[PDB]
Each structure stands twice: as structure tokens, then as C-alpha cells.
Amino acid sequence: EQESVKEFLAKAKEEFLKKWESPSQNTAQLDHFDRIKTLGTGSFGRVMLVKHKETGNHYAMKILDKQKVVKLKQIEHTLNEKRILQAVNFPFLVKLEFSFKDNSNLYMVMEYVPGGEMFSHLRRIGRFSEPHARFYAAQIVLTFEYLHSLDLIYRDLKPENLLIDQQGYIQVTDFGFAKRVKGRTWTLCGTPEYLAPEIILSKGYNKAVDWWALGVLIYEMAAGYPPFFADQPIQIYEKIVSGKVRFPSHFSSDLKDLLRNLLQVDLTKRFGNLKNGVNDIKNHKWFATTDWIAIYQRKVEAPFIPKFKGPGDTSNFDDYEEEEIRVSINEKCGKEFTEF
Numbered sequence: 050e051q052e053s054v055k056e057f058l059a060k061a062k063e064e065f066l067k068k069w070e071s072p073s074q075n076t077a078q079l080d081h082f083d084r085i086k087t088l089g090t091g092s093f094g095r096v097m098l099v100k101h102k103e104t105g106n107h108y109a110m111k112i113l114d115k116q117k118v119v120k121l122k123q124i125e126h127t128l129n130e131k132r133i134l135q136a137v138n139f140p141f142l143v144k145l146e147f148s149f150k151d152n153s154n155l156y157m158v159m160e161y162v163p164g165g166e167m168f169s170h171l172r173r174i175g176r177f178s179e180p181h182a183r184f185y186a187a188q189i190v191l192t193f194e195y196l197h198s199l200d201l202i203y204r205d206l207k208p209e210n211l212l213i214d215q216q217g218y219i220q221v222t223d224f225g226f227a228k229r230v231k232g233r234t235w236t237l238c239g240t241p242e243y244l245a246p247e248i249i250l251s252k253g254y255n256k257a258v259d260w261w262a263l264g265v266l267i268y269e270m271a272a273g274y275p276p277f278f279a280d281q282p283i284q285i286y287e288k289i290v291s292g293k294v295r296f297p298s299h300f301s302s303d304l305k306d307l308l309r310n311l312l313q314v315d316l317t318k319r320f321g322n323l324k325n326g327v328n329d330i331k332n333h334k335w336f337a338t339t340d341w342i343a344i345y346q347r348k349v350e351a352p353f354i355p356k357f358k359g360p361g362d363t364s365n366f367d368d369y370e371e372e373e374i375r376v377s378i379n380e381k382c383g384k385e386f387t388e389f
């Protein structure tokens with residue numbers, strides 16, 4: 050790699066480590082915000098559009114219920130998510146603006162991206178052209194180069210976690226499975242269609258799982274459906290471990306070749322995990338038209354700009370039952386979340 054890249058990544062790691070070793074804590078409180086609308090909801094948390102009452106800025110506030118985090122065995126994952134997010138800085142990662150906790154919940158207040166999830170746009174349009182898929186893929190390649198250099202594995206790449214911003218660029222959201230790992234890690238996590246074989250087979254796995262997931266994402270963007278579909282998880286898993294993938298005839302030869310090397314079941318042969326690391330991907334013919342520096346600098350005109358009316362528009366997100374943000378009169382799970 051050019052010394053220019055080496056020096057960039059050295060500074061990136063220095064800055065990450067300073068924040069990693071001394072995390073920010075308790076930088077706002079709930080009553081600084083008005084609640085606007087629920088943007089998503091899951092088994093232990095929700096994301097809400099909020100507005101800061103003094104500045105008028107909009108934010109996406111992720112709210113995690115401490116008791117449900119404990120019950121679903123997500124303590125370390127939630128601590129990872131916040132400690133990582135407060136320490137990273139890259140053009141394609143959503144920014145954490147504030148965090149805090151109260152008697153009941155953990156809160157991460159992030160920039161709000163009104164363009165919505167890539168998933169919605171992909172399903173609406175059907176499939177992206179190769180140039181369009183490639184534009185997004187290049188951003189993920191650079192993001193993973195950054196994260197992996199910091200010893201971070203992302204572990205949740207999928208279209209729902211990629212928001213489209215006002216310039217048409219990606220912002221990765223949801224660091225719930227991200228982890229700082231020197232070497233291997235073992236937790237079963239991630240969505241079935243995106244899991245690498247070594248996760249399915251309960252092995253100690255490493256950053257190569259993110260490169261596998263990039264193969265899945267590129268396939269899904271370009272085809273409109275993922276490479277290993279089925280009705281039950283076990284049937285998906287059988288397909289993933291099999292070493293077989295079929296490509297639509299509309300895929301270019303270069304696309305197929307790249308995908309065979311990302312969707313390589315043998316992790317020791319998978320692109321991104323060889324001696325040349327990320328450069329085997331960056332130098333692949335499918336990326337021959339990609340100006341990597343221009344992508345990083347956000348100088349490339351994007352394939353499309355989501356339609357939205359302004360920073361408070363929620364039209365690109367869907368509608369959920371609006372539930373209370375209740376805060377117990379008694380502290381819950383204080384010990385478990387001391388460091389948050």
C-alpha cells in the first residue's frame with residue numbers, strides 16, 4: 050500500500066485508541082429532546098426520531114431497555130456498540146452525537162439520515178445496476194479497511210443497516226454486533242442470509258466474515274435477492290456451507306469472478322483475508338472504474354438522491370405503534386452497565 054494509505058491508517062488508529070481508552074459518557078439527558086416518531090423496533094430496543102429542544106436539530110435516538118438486554122444476553126454487545134461508536138470517525142459511519150443512561154434504558158443519539166435504508170430502495174427499484182452497486186460496494190470496502198485496521202469486526206452487514214444520505218452516500222448504522230477483536234471471536238450473531246460458513250459451523254472466526262458478507266451484499270444489490278435464500282434458517286445454512294452459488298446471466302464476468310472470491314467457503318482463500326488484504330478487492334477488474342480517493346472524499350456524483358422534504362421528514366421509514374419511553378423510579382441493572 051502507498052505510504053499515504055499507511056500514514057492515514059496510522060493516524061486513524063491513534064485517534065480511535067485515544068477515544069477507546071477514555072470513552073465519553075453522559076453527554077445529554079432525555080428531557081433535552083422531544084419525541085417525534087418511532088422509526089424501528091426490535092426485541093430489546095427501538096430507534097426514535099427526536100428533536101433537540103434548544104438547537105432544533107433532529108437525531109435518531111436508539112433506546113435499549115436494560116432489563117431486556119440482560120434477558121437476551123446482549124450486555125457485552127451493547128457495551129461494545131457504544132464504546133466503538135463513540136471512538137470511530139469515518140465518512141461512511143453514522144456519527145454518535147450523545148449518549149446517556151437512566152434507571153431503565155441506554156440511549157445513543159446519532160445523526161438522523163432521512164433518506165432511509167438501502168433495503169427499501171433496493172426492494173422498490175428491484176435491483177441496482179452494476180455501477181450503482183459498485184458505488185455502494187466501494188464505500189463498504191473502504192469502511193471495512195478502516196474498521197479492520199482498528200481491529201474492529203462489524204458482523205452485521207445487510208441492506209437494512211446502510212442508510213442513504215442527502216448526497217446519496219452510505220452511512221452504516223447499527224453497531225450492535227461490532228467488536229474489537231485481535232484474532233478470533235466466537236459469538237453466533239448476524240442475519241442468516243449474510244452469515245459466513247465459519248460462523249454457521251461454530252468456529253473461531255475473524256474479519257474474513259465481513260468480506261464474505263460483502264459478497265452477499267454485492268450479489269443482493271446486483272440481483273435483487275441474496276445468493277442463499279430459503280424458507281427455514283437450516284436450509285439457508287445448508288446452501289451457505291455447500292460451496293455452490295448460481296449467478297444470474299445478466300451478471301458481468303468480472304462481477305461473477307469477484308463474487309466467487311468473496312463467497313469463498315475456505316476462509317484462508319477468501320478475498321480480503323489473503324496476504325494482499327483489501328488490495329485484492331480494490332485491484333479487481335470489477336472495481337477498475339472506481340476512483341477510491343474520490344469516493345472517500347465524496348466527490349463522485351451518486352447514483353440517486355433519496356426523495357425527502359427536509360431533515361425532519363420520516364416518509365422513507367415505515368409506521369410503528371407508538372409506545373411509551375418509561376423510566377422506572379428505581380435503577381435497573383446498574384452494575385451491568387456501569388461503563389456505559
Ligand SMILES: C[N+](C)(C)C[C@H](O)CC(=O)O
Nearest residue numbers: 104105106107108360361
Ligand atoms: C434549523 N436547524 C439548523 C436548527 C436544524 C436543521 O434543520 C437540521 C435538523 O433539523 O436536524
